[PDB]
Amino acid sequence: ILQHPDGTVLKQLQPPPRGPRELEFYNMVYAADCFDGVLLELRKYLPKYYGIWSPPTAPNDLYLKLEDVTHKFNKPCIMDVKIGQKSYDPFASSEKIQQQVSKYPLMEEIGFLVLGMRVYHVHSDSYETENQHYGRSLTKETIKDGVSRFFHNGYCLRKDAVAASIQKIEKILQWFENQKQLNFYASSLLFVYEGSSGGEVEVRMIDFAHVFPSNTIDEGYVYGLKHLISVLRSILDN
Ligand SMILES: COc1cc(O)c2c(=O)c(O)c(-c3ccc(O)c(O)c3)oc2c1
């Protein structure tokens, strides 16, 4: 993900079929002639999309030009959380389903997975980062404390950012409770708050290489959001 100074990032398309599917998702949602109310409302929760991009001398090399959701922050604290009970799509082979469930076998039980975090610590004027193995190590016994770490700045728990995150997730949940036309697999929520207020908190949906047409509620995604809200809610009692 290449960061441009003008507040928009360039996300390289994943290899096929994943990159192409993510391009068609953004194109569908941000279609200039779209008047589907479900899709127009969905735009509120995604990074703004500026179209396909490639370097002038390299039309082979495909990127999505997207809003940098951290741009308005001075010391952004960033957490990426995968949502859903299944991290594989409805058309995966048995081998791939097994590979995806083995990556984190608690996905069905918990409904979400912390992919990484970058947290600003006030006393040291520095960041502490957690990679993919942090969230994959969390169980039902340790998910609450695992999530809490994102909101602890070295001297206090940022309950303002926790409460704001609940309020922003709730609008996303309401969108999912009022649509029956898309199911989202291996998609995420990007959380951002100000490390240096309630407070600039940004919560945005990202990662759309496995979004499919459907006739039903995305039950796995709803389950994940609800459980994530419940965990964040319990953190307010710390
Ligand atoms: C579909 O994918 C997207 C779309 C986006 O719009 C952003 C985005 O805006 C962003 O800041 C980041 C990001 C930047 C720096 C980090 O350290 C980090 O963990 C995430 O990832 C994105 C991914």
Residue 62 CB neighbour total at 10 angstroms: 17
List 82's β-bridge partners, or say none.
113, 188
3-state secondary structure of 174: helix
Burial class (CB in 10 A: 0-12, 13-18, 19+), 57: exposed
Q: What is the resolution of this structure in A?
A: 2.0
| Contact in structure between 204 and 178 (CB atoms under 8 Å) | no
CB 83 within 8 A of CB 111: yes
Q: Say how far residue 90 (Cα) sits from the centre of its chain.
A: 20
| Cα(12)–Cα(194) distance, integer angstroms | 27
Task: Report the residue numbers after which the chain has a gap, meaning the C atom sits over 2.5 angstroms from the next written residue's N, or none.
Answer: 196
Give me ligand 1 centre to Cα 11, in Å.
8
94 C-alpha to center of ligand 1: Å? Answer: 31
Residues paired with 52 in a beta bridge: 64
DSSP structural state of residue 33: T
Q: How far apart are CA 201 and CA 171, in angstroms?
A: 14
> Quick one: which atom of ligand 1 is closest to the CA of 78?
19
In the block, tokens 């594989």 appear at: 88
**Technique used to solve these coordinates:** X-ray
Q: What is the DSSP letter of 181?
A: S
- CA nearest neighbour of 183 among 109, 87, 105, 102: 87
Contacts of residue 94, Cβ cutoff 8 Å, sequence gap at least 6: none
Query: Given the structure tokens 């980062």, which residue do they identify?
Result: 129
**Which structure tokens are listed for 95?**
């081998």
Distance CA 22, CA 13 (A): 8
Tell me 166's DSSP state.
H
Which run of H or of E encompasses 99? helix 94-103
Q: Which of 141, 151, 150 is nearest to 106 (CA)?
A: 141
Backbone angles phi, psi at 144, to 5 degrees: -65, -55
The strand pairing partners of 53, in sequence order, are: 63
Strand order in the sheet with 112-121: 126-130, 112-121, 76-83, 187-194, 201-206
Nearest alpha carbon, ligand 1 atom 23: 206
Residues with CB under 6 A from ligand 1: 1, 9, 11, 47, 66-70, 78, 80, 118, 190, 206-207
Contact 180, 216 (CB under 8 A): yes
Task: Give distance in angstroms: CA of 212 to centre of ligand 1.
Answer: 22
E-assigned strand segments in the chain: 2-3, 8-12, 49-53, 63-67, 76-83, 112-121, 126-130, 182-184, 187-194, 201-206, 211-213
